């Protein structure tokens, strides 16, 4: 590795075509790609740096309801009138989610003692020996005891040490008690912060009347909601959900750009139902949970249990805030360049397809409209230089009677040449700038061939004739003796390379002979690549040998050039 | 398709330039790109596979406070001394967030009954008929009834069935009761898990003194905090926030690499305020909520209601853990390759710009410093081979008096040729390796042109002259008769392709005549691509025709080659 | 900017190689890349648009337990038998997480008053002057007062205004009270929604027996779990965790494709422990908290405090739903194209490596197996066209005695030429299609050189000789006088370009002389690029000058061509 090898810059080589069709196609594709990427950049705001948000939600529910119920306690039933305020139908969860009671089922006066279990469907027992001591299972309000007692006249149930009077499995009461909760109100206060952009805002703005209510079109940016409207917008019925509660969800979409020329950051409110739309025959249809209020009277602990059915609103906050940024632009321009190669790849594909040489056969005479596209063939000739790898089996042969050249890339295995065939190939056209300057063996149709002198193993390659059919030989013409066998022209060609060589040298003869071989190939096999592997016939070879003979040893043959 | 077509590998063709400037530019750009990508890989740790974390947080607040307040109950007021412990100013939320009370406002002795409403601002009523029965609205503590009663001497308000004595709307008491909460302490225990890397850890380490407090510099990794310092770090005031509570937020950043040579995983604590910086005249400035304690005495249900103002800390855990991975390296090396094309594209752009041929006119003589950059023009000649598509309208004309060639890609519409002009173009230089080998019509300035014999529609194309101005003809020279009209040289050129054709053939004459046309084009239009579409003048054409005449039919004209 | 310069389409230029090895390598690499991308597309389902989920969880725990404990109140101890039901060991959290009590430690009969503090380890005090009034610290149940009192006979402690009888710091009681909670049951109801795909579903399906239990293999899709099995699957022990509680975690993985031909969406349940694996000597091992139950009797407020140790389950729901989408396919096909260049880059690298020209020296004779790979050199000759930039220092020299050409890109600084050396370079081969056509100064070894006439500063460049060693001159041959000094051939070469120039012109001589210089270069420096910068010796120069002399002024020298 030398210093001169470090400064070498390597550059691709191209060809330029002046055509209206390809130019129009190229510019159309470039313009539409530019339009697409610009539209995407302007729509999606890819020039902006986007960042997620940090949210904080606070909720306040308001409303009152009345209830009238035949309540039981100590075996005494009586109609009681009660009121439910905010502190009674809500629990202090203090988060994004909040709860609202719509129906309840309570049992009061409970105290820890022995009592019979309420006989449910299939829990009857009229045998004191059937029960088992200290056995617990789900759907059981207590621990079982070996004894037995009657729950009522003509009723027999197992004893249990638990809270008594034990709660009895009841379905939810329909119509609900707190169906009036369809008229309650909510207030949702959301503060959102983009830290990276250093922006903070809130859904509430100055001047809003607090006696407002959210409507989809009338008053959209009023954070106060009505619990009936949330179900009305979707199509659900609150009076049916109240009996067996169900989960609801609110979504607050924040999408805005923190640019001075376009600064609108407002929340969009949406609603969704997360629970399954349950019906009769469903398995687990309702949302419910139990909770107790403890107390004591006359030195004895007691509780009041409440199974509460009610909705649950799961607030969901998601968004992204964008602001102008310069590096994202550069990142996008870096990506567009790969897309910009469509015209190049498409037009190259069109050329390579239309230069197949099969279209001239059938599709062109059939259609009769795509004729001038044959022009593309010319482009291929000015774009693709086809070659072939050199190998010892590579040979070329030309016959004067035929117009084309025959390549041979196969071993002989003793067979005589010109009896084996190979893929045809056409000869190239001569550079006209220089052209303007001006008895016998069985395998010879020429009559003038000679047998080979090489060994019996390698001589079959030398078996050849100038003409494949009989009638004429190449060496009988005059151009042959003018070009090849002219000693003066060959001496001139040798002087053109080495002008100071001596013409009286003894070993000069062979030198001339070598040139004569090339002087044949260039006549027939024009290309130097095709001429290095060309093989002369026997007649021309032995003519040249008799004009330029060797005496010391036997003649050699086709030596591999490398 | 063919088998020989499947093994064909297609390779791009390039040119190699030995220049110090381009080499230095190339290597500079390569080195700086390498430096940038290596710096990015080392800084961002892109060689690592990253994974998010799974967190579990637990909190414990500790501290005590005293309160002295004139409490009311049953119309009896008296000064009472009370204590607030951990179980009193907190609620069992059991999550990431937790709550602390800083101010309260309570009403005790409530019972469900009829009572008057407390007259708020604008809720006075001195008319029994004005009220409506069975009406509910927000900001109302109960259901209204048609009756009316006096709340006090000289006071008249509406009756309601609700909890009595009904709570009266008051502002938050200032100074706050639990301002002492600025000295309470917190303990935060966070456990994090990276499942994919299988790494579990915790913020607490062995040996930390439990009698520590968080400081930004003194003792950073002490998870115990002080509620006053959290506000003091930001610049807030706890005494002003205690009156109307506000939300606070703690952030715990985990960023660490699970590599054996670099293993430091420690949390970073940060603070932020999620609520708005509220002040006077704001609408909804305070965090608060209501909760109730139920009980009963002498067989009657009662409750104690508490409107609580306090802060709410929202703990936020975000992080990512990285560990060494081999495939990410490969993915990054795969991406660098597209970036590495900067030198190529930039230098090619420089060449294409400096080879515009306009710089030689104005900018070079003006600046007088970018002269040697004209060298780049040569590179263009060795890089871009320009061509033109063949079409029937395509024609080339050359006049001996002018030095350049005239292209014509436009229809004639009956106009005589050489009266219409087209874009100039220079002739290519001859391959010197071969060059070293050695009355009249109105539209002719040459005096030797002849009229055309083609039809009247298509003959105007043949109208031409050798010279555009008068004075001389081409056929008067000697090189003309040496090259074209020499029967021997043309016969030799025919033998060079088909050495066995007979010179006695009657149809050979026309053959020779065809060659003569090419022998003119190659003399003037050197390139074969240009020579195939060249057009001879009339004088030379008819000279060639008289030397090689036809008798059977009329002569044809310029046939399209393909 | 011309119009014709807008329709110019630029196309890369290539060379096509016919080789079995490179074709096989190309197709192998293409097929394996195709296989890889297809396998990735089928495995990762990249043909689908994926979307995250929106989840809603609801829990219900069931089970009962009994406790027998020597409970204390008012200095009276007695054995008490209690029961714990669903409302007694759970708290209404109503979220993803839920809590279960496994151990408790309670203190009842508390009332706000003055009492002594329980003497802990190191909190003794036998001196009334040591205490301080109005001092609060953590680990203290109340505010300290200056007075002192005895907690018991032979015990002295500080007085405090707080809840009395004050709770005493105790360790967790082992064995736990609610170890029976290993046999409780849970029910988890999860509803998921994919909005974009518009698909709602639930883990529960019709027909499941509600008397089921989750098993990893037997009954996987039974959402009922047993709290002992959750620990048993991992390897933990519930009885050891129940004393000092710890956090557990459930994970629900939804991975499914919403395609009609493949529609299976079922949850996978997994378990994990989020808390640390704690043992003896650890610092903060347990999850616990405190909560109180308030009441009043005989007109006096009271509370019962409970320190609860228990587990906390943190349900975690993550997943992604996929459905078929057409644009993602196009996006993937767009990405594969960059990958497809492997064969091209690899084979070009192989060619550029094997064409280094160093392999022929050492590695080939050593290995003796990679000989035919030398063939690749030929490809390089058909691919890379090496050139050199023109500059005023660039010169070329050739000596007939040597076979190669010497490049010189260095300033002389007054030194005589042919005494300075430069990098060698071989001469290119002649186009054989045209080749078939047919006293003295100190620094001259030729004997025929002349001194220079240029100024003393610039004449050293002209100092040169044809032969580097003595014995022969070039101008003594016959080819020299046949090519260069032949007035007729030069006149013909001039007529070949400008056929109408007059041979009687006085200024024609110099013209011929100029041509003679070129007629030397093409003889020795075959390329036109190398010939434009070639420099003649003195002997040939002055021979040409004597055959074509100038009389008016002194002869100039080598002028820069551009
Ligand atoms: N769901 C709600 N529906 C209607 N009005 C509400 C609602 N929630 C709060 N408000 C009213 O809007 C205003 C803002 O409530 P905010 O909590 O900020 O003040 P407040 O004095 O603490 O409320 P409160 O009436 O409970 O004392 C109050 O006048 C309040 O009466
Ligand atoms: N905010 C806090 N400030 C100061 N010390 C604390 C705080 N929280 C907990 N601790 C102390 O740090 C240690 C760890 O608390 P941990 O809950 O693990 O044990 P503990 O004995 O159950 O707590 P305790 O009985 O005091 O309620 C305890 O000694 C505890 O007193
Ligand atoms: N952990 C659980 N273990 C066993 N069974 C349960 C469990 N949770 C609920 N169930 C049973 O499965 C069914 C579904 O419970 P669901 O809440 O939907 O109805 P429910 O009548 O309100 O339940 P219950 O009144 O017994 O509390 C019920 O029969 C219920 O008894
Ligand atoms: C919405 O569903 C509720 C059920 O909760 C419907 O309530 C019934 O309405 C019909 C009127 O068609 C009355 O005849 C019934 O008396 C109502 N049920 C009860 C229990 O009172 C309600 O009708 C539905 N919405 C509308 C607009 O009808
Ligand atoms: C922080 O804000 C509080 C208000 O809550 C300030 O409290 C007052 O401090 C001034 C001293 O400048 C006293 O004169 C007032 O008596 C304080 N207010 C009350 C109600 O007592 C406090 O001053 C502020 N911080 C500092 C350092 O002054
Ligand atoms: C799981 O851990 C528990 C500890 O909570 C072990 O309980 C002990 O089990 C051994 C049996 O090897 C008994 O001798 C002890 O009496 C048990 N401890 C108590 C307090 O009763 C339990 O053994 C462990 N699991 C197994 C399978 O042994
Ligand atoms: N293309 C081609 N080259 C040949 C042929 N015959 C000989 N050559 C070359 O000519 C040389 C051998 O010629 P030859 O008559 O045997 O003389 P020798 O070397 O003294 O035996 C070698 O350099 C061969 O490469 C032929 O038939 N075709
Ligand atoms: N480039 C060029 N080719 C010509 C011109 N004239 C004739 N040719 C070719 O010469 C042939 C016609 O020659 P022509 O004298 O008409 O003989 P004809 O074919 O017997 O009528 C055709 O192959 C033409 O393509 C010309 O003016 N310029
Ligand atoms: N490559 C090369 N070109 C030369 C050389 N000498 C002269 N030229 C060219 O020939 C012209 C000068 O020839 P010269 O004998 O000085 O005649 P002058 O122009 O009347 O002075 C210029 O155009 C030179 O570029 C030489 O030695 N080598
Ligand atoms: C001549 O030899 C016949 C041409 C053979 C080349 C065939 C090229 C086929 C190209 C098809 C590509 C279509 C575009 C598909 C994009 C997804
Ligand atoms: C000769 O014909 C004049 C040259 C015309 C080509 C002009 C090319 C302009 C290229 C500008 C590119 C600047 C870099 C922009 C990167 C974002
Ligand atoms: C001839 O002058 C010698 C050839 C010099 C070229 C050396 C090219 C080395 C290429 C190494 C690339 C290996 C693959 C690495 C992939 C990560
Ligand atoms: C605000 O709107 C409400 C409801 O629409 C109505 O009372 C009135 O238009 C406004 N009230 C006040 C107080 O501004
Ligand atoms: C630990 O630090 C604390 C507070 O700084 C101090 O009491 C002492 O330096 C250490 N205490 C113990 C018990 O190690
Ligand atoms: C369902 O399964 C349970 C438990 O395996 C068992 O009682 C029985 O196989 C089925 N019971 C019912 C009621 O379908
Ligand atoms: Zn023969
Ligand atoms: Zn023959
Ligand atoms: Zn004329
Ligand atoms: Zn003329
Ligand atoms: Zn000399
Ligand atoms: Zn000499």
Rg (CA), chain B: 52
The whole-angstrom separation of Cα B162 and Cα B141 is: 7
Residue nearest to atom 20 of ligand 5 (CA): B175
Closest ligand to Cα C354: 12
Residues on chain A touching B26 (C-beta within 8 angstroms): 9
Cβ neighbours of B83 in C, within 8 Å = 112, 142-143, 161-163
**Structure tokens belonging to residue C383:** 């691919």
A474 close to A465: Cβ distance less than 8 angstroms:
no
Chain A nearest C-alpha distance from B269 (Å): 16
Long-range contacts, stretch A354-359, CB < 8 angstroms, 24+ apart: A355/A379, A355/A380
Helix (H, G, I), strand (E, B), or coil: what is residue A377? helix
Method of determination used here: cryo-EM
Inter-chain CB pairs, A–B, below 8 Å: 212
Helix axes B326-339, B20-44, angle to 10 degrees: 150
Asked whether the CA dihedral B412, B413, B419, B424 is positive or negative, the reply is: negative
**B36 labelled ligand-binding:** no
Q: Find tokens 């400096």 and name the residue.
A: B354
Name all chains with 3 or more CB-CB pairs below 8 Å to chain C. A, B
DSSP class per residue in B431-476: -HHHHT-----TT-SSS------S-TTT-GGG---S-SSSS--STT
Question: Do residues C544 and C513 make contact, with C-beta atoms less than 8 angstroms apart?
Answer: yes
Hey, is C301 helix, strand or coil?
strand
Please state whether beta strands A267-273 and C48-51 pair in parallel, antiparallel, or not at all (unpaired): unpaired
Q: Which two structure tokens, joined as six digits, stand for B483?
A: 């090259």
Ligand 2: which atom is nearest the Cα of residue C290? 27
Structure tokens at C431: 């186009």
Vertex A407 angle, CA A406 and A408, to 5°: 120
Q: Hey, is A536 helix, strand or coil?
A: coil
> Tokens representing C31?
């097929």
- Interval between CA B292 and ligand 1 midpoint (Å): 18
Q: Which residues of B465-482 are buried (b: 16+ CB within 10 A; e: fewer)?
A: bbbeeeebbbbebeebee
Cα dist from C168 to B327, C106, C112, C200, C288, whole Å:
59, 10, 16, 53, 16
**CA nearest to A445, candidates A409, A408, A402:** A402
Given a contact cutoff of 8 angstroms between Cβ atoms, the answer to whether C56 and C185 are in contact is no
Indicate the top mutation candidate among A508, A558, A562 to test ligand 7's pocket, ranked by most ligand atoms within 8 A of CB. A558
Helix ranges restricted to H, C393-497: 432-435, 479-483, 487-497
Ligand 4 contact, A237 CB (< 6 A): yes
Rounded Cα distance, C510 and C507, in Å? 6
Where do the DSSP E strands lie in B279-422? 288-296, 301-324, 384-388, 395-398, 405-408
Q: What residue's CA is closest to ligand 9, atom 11? A: C514
Going by the DSSP 8-state scheme, the letter that residue C259 receives in this structure is: B
The phi and psi torsions of B516 (rounded to 5 degrees) equal -60, -40
Kindly list the residues from chain B whose CB atom is less than 8 angstroms away from the CB atom of residue A60.
Answer: 289
Q: Kind of pairing, strands A267-273 and A247-257?
A: antiparallel
Residue A207's region, left for phi above 0, alpha for psi from -120 to 50, else beta, is: left
The Cα C539–Cα C545 span in angstroms is 10
- Count other Cβ atoms within 10 Å, centred on residue A21: 15
DSSP lists the bridge partners of residue C253 as C268, C318
The three-state secondary structure class of A445 is: coil
**Which residue's structure tokens are 């055309």?**
B452
**Which residue(s) pair with A55 in the sheet?**
A192
Which residue in C54, C400, C432 is closest to A518 by CB distance? C432
Q: Which residue, C152, C142, C147, is CA-closest to C119?
A: C152
Instruction: For residue B402, report the distance from its CA to the centre of ligand 18, in Å.
Output: 15
Residue B313's nearest CA partner among B229, B189, B227 is B227
Distance of alpha carbon A82 from alpha carbon B137, whole angstroms: 18
Pseudo-torsion of CA A480, A481, A483, A484, nearest 10°? Answer: 90
Token pair of B443 as six digits: 């539209």
Data resolution in angstroms: 3.3
d(CA C507, CA C496): 18
Contact in structure between C230 and C312 (CB atoms under 8 Å): no
Counting Cβ atoms within 10 Å, is residue B56 exposed (0-12), middle (13-18) or buried (19+)?
buried
Torsion, Cα A218 A221 A226 A231, to 10 degrees, reads 80
| Burial state string for B78-93 with b = 16 or more CB within 10 A and e = fewer than 16 | eeeeebbbbbbbbbbb
Asked if C98 and C313 touch (Cβ cutoff 8 Å), the reply is yes
Length of chain B: 562
Rg (CA), chain C: 52
* CA–CA dist C281, C492 (Å, integer): 112
Atom of ligand 11 at shortest distance to CA of B358?
A: 1
Dihedral of the alpha carbons of B527, B533, B538, B542, in degrees to the nearest 10:
80
The three-class DSSP label of residue B10 is strand
Q: Is B391 left (phi over 0), alpha (psi -120 to 50) or beta?
A: beta
- Least Cα distance to A518 among A503, A535, A506 occurs for A535
Question: Residue C350: how many CA atoms within 13 Å on its side-chain side?
Answer: 16
**Greatest CA separation found in chain A?**
150
Contact C289 B94 (CB under 8 A): yes
Q: How far apart are the first and last CA of chain B?
A: 25
For A105, half-sphere exposure in the C-beta direction (CA atoms, 13 angstrom radius) is: 19
CA distance C339 to C34: 10
Cα separation of B277 and B279, whole Å?
7
**Distance (Å, rounded) from C-alpha A188 to C-alpha A252?**
10
CB B396 within 8 A of CB B408: yes
DSSP lists the bridge partners of residue A256 as A321
> What is the bridge-based pairing of β-strands C14-18 and B267-272?
unpaired
Residue A364: CB atoms within 10 Å: 15
Which residue of chain B is at minimal alpha-carbon distance from C294? B293
Q: Give how far C92 is from chain A: nearest CA, Å.
A: 7
Determine phi and psi for B421, rounding to 5 degrees.
-115, 160
In this structure, the strands spanning C98-116 and C155-164 are antiparallel
| Backbone dihedral angles phi then psi of residue C5, each to the nearest 5 degrees | -85, 5
Q: What is the CA radius of gyration of chain A?
A: 52
Return the ligand 8 atom nearest residue B534 CA: 1
Strands B384-388 and A14-18, bridge-based pairing? parallel
DSSP per residue, B331-351: HHHHHHHHHTTHHHHHHHHHH
Whole-angstrom Cα distance, residue B507 to residue B527?
A: 29
Tokens of A470: 């009989």
Count CB atoms within 10 A of the CB of residue B444. Answer: 21
Residue A211 makes CB contacts below 8 A (sequence gap 6+) with none
* Cβ contact B389–A18 (<8 Å): yes
Contacts 24+ apart (CB under 8 A), C516-522: C516/C484, C516/C485, C516/C490, C516/C544, C516/C547, C516/C548, C517/C544, C518/B432, C519/B436, C519/C483, C519/C484, C519/C490, C519/C493, C520/C484, C522/B432, C522/B433, C522/B435, C522/B436
* C558 Cβ closer than 6 Å to some ligand 9 atom: yes
Partners of residue A310 on adjacent β-strands: A101
DSSP conformational letter for A535? -
- How far is it, in rounded angstroms, from Cα C17 to Cα B9? 5
**Distance from the C203 Cα atom to the nearest Cα atom in chain A, whole angstroms:** 11
Which residue on chain B is closest to A56 by alpha carbon? B274
- The β-bridge partners of A79 are A70
3-state secondary structure of B233: helix
Count of CB contacts below 8 A, B vs C?
208
Would you tell me how many other CB atoms lie within 10 Å of the CB of residue B410? 13
Contacts of A96 (CB under 8 A, 6+ apart): A57, A314, A315, A316, A317
Q: How far apart are CA B143 and CA A65, in angstroms?
A: 8
**Shortest CA distance to C202 belongs to which of C343, C58, C70, C83?**
C58
Query: Among candidates C555, C554, C460, which has minimal Cα distance to C517?
Result: C555
Q: Is A338 annotated as a binding residue?
A: yes
Extract the tokens encoding A559.
Answer: 């030596």
A92 vs B289: CB contact, 8 Å cut-off? yes
Conformation bin of residue C488: beta by default, left when phi > 0, alpha when psi is -120 to 50: alpha
A346-352: long-range contacts at Cβ-Cβ below 8 A with a sequence spacing of 24 or more? A346/A25, A346/A29, A347/A22, A347/A25, A347/A26, A347/C9, A347/C11, A348/C11, A348/C12, A350/A376, A351/A376, A351/A379, A351/A380, A351/A383, A351/C11, A352/A380
- Residue A240 alpha carbon, nearest atom of ligand 4: 5
Chain breaks in chain B (C to N over 2.5 A) after: 438
Give buried/exposed letters for B126-140 (b at 16+ CB in 10 A, else e).
eeeeebeeeeeeeeb
| Orientation of helix A538-547 relative to helix A508-524, angle to 10° | 150
- Token readout for A560 is 């591999």
Ligand nearest to the CA of B561: 8
Instruction: Please tell me the residue having the least CA distance from ligand 10 atom 11.
Output: A349
> Of C304, C318, C309, C258, whose CA–CA distance to C286 is shortest?
C309
């Amino acid at each position: 590795c030398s210093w001169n090898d470090v400064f070498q810059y390597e550059t691709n080589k191209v060809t330029r075509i002046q055509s209206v069709n390809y130019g129009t196609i190229k510019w159309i594709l470039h313009m539409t790609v530019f339009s697409y990427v610009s539209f995407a950049l302007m729509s999606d705001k890819l020039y902006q740096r986007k960042e997620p948000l940090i949210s904080s939600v606070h909720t306040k529910v308001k409303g009152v309801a009345e209830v009238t119920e035949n309540v039981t306690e100590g075996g005494v039933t009586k109609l009681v009138h009660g009121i439910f305020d905010t502190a009674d139908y809500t629990l202090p969860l203090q988060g994004n989610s909040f709860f609202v009671m719509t129906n309840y089922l309570k049992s009061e006066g409970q105290e820890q003692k022995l009592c019979p279990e309420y006989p449910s469907r299939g829990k009857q027992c009229h045998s004191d020996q059937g029960c088992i001591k200290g056995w617990m299972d789900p759907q059981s309000k207590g621990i079982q005891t070996g004894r037995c007692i009657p729950y009522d006249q003509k009723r027999k149930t197992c004893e249990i040490f638990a809270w008594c009077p034990a709660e009895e499995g009841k379905e939810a009461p329909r119509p609900a008690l707190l169906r009036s909760a369809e008229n309650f109100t909510v207030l949702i206060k959301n503060n959102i912060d983009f830290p990276g952009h250093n922006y903070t805002t809130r859904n509430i703005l100055p001047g809003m009347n607090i006696s407002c209510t959210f409507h989809k079109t009338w008053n959209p940016q009023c954070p106060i909601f009505r619990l009936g409207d949330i179900f009305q917008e979707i199509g659900e019925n609150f009076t049916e959900v109240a009996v067996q509660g169900g989960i609801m969800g609110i979504e607050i979409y924040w999408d805005c750009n923190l640019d001075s020329w376009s600064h609108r950051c407002q929340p969009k409110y949406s609603f969704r139902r997360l629970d399954d739309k349950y019906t009769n025959e469903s398995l687990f249809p309702g949302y419910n949970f139990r909770y107790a209020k403890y107390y004591k009277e006359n030195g004895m602990e007691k509780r009041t249990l409440i199974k509460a059915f009610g909705v649950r609103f799961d607030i969901l906050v998601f968004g992204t805030g964008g602001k102008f940024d310069i590096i994202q632009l550069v990142v996008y321009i870096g990506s567009t360049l790969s897309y910009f190669g469509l015209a190049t790849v498409c037009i190259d594909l069109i050329i390579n397809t239309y230069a197949s040489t099969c279209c001239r056969s059938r599709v062109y005479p059939s259609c009769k409209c795509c004729e001038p596209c044959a022009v593309n063939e010319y482009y291929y000739r000015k774009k693709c230089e086809p070659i072939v790898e050199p190998k010892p089996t590579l040979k070329y042969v030309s016959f004067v009677d035929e117009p084309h050249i025959w390549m041979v890339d196969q071993q002989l295995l003793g067979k005589s040449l010109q009896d084996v065939k190979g893929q045809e190939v056409p000869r190239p056209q001569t550079d006209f700038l220089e052209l303007s300057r001006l008895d016998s063996p069985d395998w010879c149709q020429c009559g003038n061939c000679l047998p080979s002198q090489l060994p019996e193993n390698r001589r079959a390659l030398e078996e050849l004739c100038c003409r494949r059919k009989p009638g004429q030989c190449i060496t009988t013409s005059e151009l042959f003796s003018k070009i090849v066998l002219s000693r003066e022209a060959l001496q001139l060609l040798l002087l053109y390379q080495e002008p100071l060589l001596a013409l009286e040298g003894e070993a000069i003869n062979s030198k001339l002979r070598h040139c004569a071989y090339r002087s044949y190939a260039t006549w027939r096999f024009v290309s130097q690549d095709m001429a290095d592997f060309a093989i002369l016939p026997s007649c021309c070879r032995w003519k040249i040998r008799k004009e330029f003979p060797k005496t010391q040893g036997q003649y050699s043959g086709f030596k591999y050039p490398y």
